[PDB]
Structures are given as C-alpha cells and as structure tokens.
Amino acid sequence: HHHGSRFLIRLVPEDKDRAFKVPYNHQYYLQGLIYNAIKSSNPKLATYLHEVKGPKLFTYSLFMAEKREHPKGLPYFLGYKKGFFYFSTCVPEIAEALVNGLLMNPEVRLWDERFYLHEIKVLREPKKFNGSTFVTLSPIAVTVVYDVPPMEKEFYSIIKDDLQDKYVMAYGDKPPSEFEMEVLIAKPKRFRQTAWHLVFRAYGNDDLLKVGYEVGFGEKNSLGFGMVKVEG
C-alpha cells in the first residue's frame, strides 16, 4: 500500500518583516523538526522508524527561503518572507504523522528562529520519469565499504542497487534492472562527509525511477539527502 506523497511546507517567521537566519548546515535542525512532528502524532510509528534497519522510505530537501542574501564568511544566509522545505515519502502513515505533527503544533522552532506553519502544498507526481532531467533538492550521498564521486562509476551502481533495495522494501519484491544516469552538472558540498548537487537525466525502468523520486536517491535519505525534483 505505497504511493507517493510529496509536500511543500511553507513557514513564516514570527514577525512577517525581518530577516531570519538559515545556517548552511541545517540538516540536523530540520531533521529534529520532522522527527518531532512524527513522534508527536504517532509515537508507535516513530519507534518503528527509530529501529528499522535500512532506508526509512522518506526524504526532504534543504530548507530554502524566498529571496536570499548571502553575507561573507558567515555560517548562515538571510531569508525573507517565507521559509520552506519539501518532504516526500511512499508510506502513507509517515506522511500523515508528519502533517498532523505540524498541525498539532504550528509554532516551530528551528535553530535560533521562531516560525509559524503557514501552508502545506501537496504536489502532483509526474506520470512518467524515463528520460526527464532531475535536479537534486537535497544533495546525494554515496559511500562505499569512503565518498564516491559522480565522476567515478561505482557512484552509479551503488545508486542503482540502493534503488533496487528500496524497490524490494517498498513495491513488493524482485526489482527491475534497466537503469541509467547521465549527470549534466555536479557540485560538491560537505557537511561533517561530501554530498552532491546534481542535474541529471535518468533512463530506464519507470517504477524504479519513481522509487528514487519518492524516497530519495543514494544514502541517508532520512537525514535529508538525495531528494530530487523534475527540472523546470
């Protein structure tokens, strides 16, 4: 009983006029938010998720602001008007726990800032994926057992097997095998390990691509990595 839910979540700061900071490294703050919304609406689910070994079947992007404005050599940027982030899952109990957790509370605390839940926008999922160009919303992490660049070719077989491992976890059983990624742009960004912002075209089985679109490409999805969108 999987299907994709994808949300855009807009937050406004406590006073509509002022500049709110966003730390450049805010994965961990965002992750507290999401895990606290779910733990609040559904503690049994959040204990299942805390235990489960493997992908958790959900991801979310970086926290972004309307306009931006970047100081020099400061740990944060400045944002204005609205703060927002996307979240995606193929587990309907996780999507419900997250939105209700944000409803059961609408006053949100991120890093040093006070925000109020403004809107949740639900997003239509593309009919098909074979052939589209994708842009990462949060960066993709690949590690092998170190960091695996997209310019190395293990990058791709590691991604491919993980999407097959998610496909076995969340569409029944034995996974499609046609897969290809054509990276158009790669830029690294490092956090504690390196992750990659990618523009990329992807080819091959639609249900295996849909997997990656719903739950993230690569690793640490549940820590906010590998969320993609169809390029505009």
Can you tell me the distance from the alpha carbon of 22 to that of 118, in angstroms, rounded to the nearest whole number? 18
| Distance of alpha carbon 16 from the chain centroid | 26
50's CB contacts (< 8 A; 6+ apart) are none
Residue 230 one-letter amino acid? V
Element (H, E) at 229: strand 228-230
Q: Can 60 be counted among the known catalytic residues?
A: no
SS3 38: helix
Task: Measure Cα distances from 71 to 57, 85, 129, 181, 217 in Å.
Answer: 36, 22, 38, 35, 31
Question: CB neighbours (10 Å) of residue 142?
Answer: 25
Q: Can 50 be counted among the known catalytic residues?
A: yes
SS3 67: coil
Handedness of CA 215, 219, 223, 229 (dihedral sign): negative
Could you say which of 35, 76, 156, 203 is catalytic?
A: 35
Q: Angle formed by the axes of helices 206-215 and 154-170, to 10°?
A: 90
Could you say which of 3, 24, 28, 50 is catalytic?
A: 50
Catalytic sites, residue numbers: 35, 50
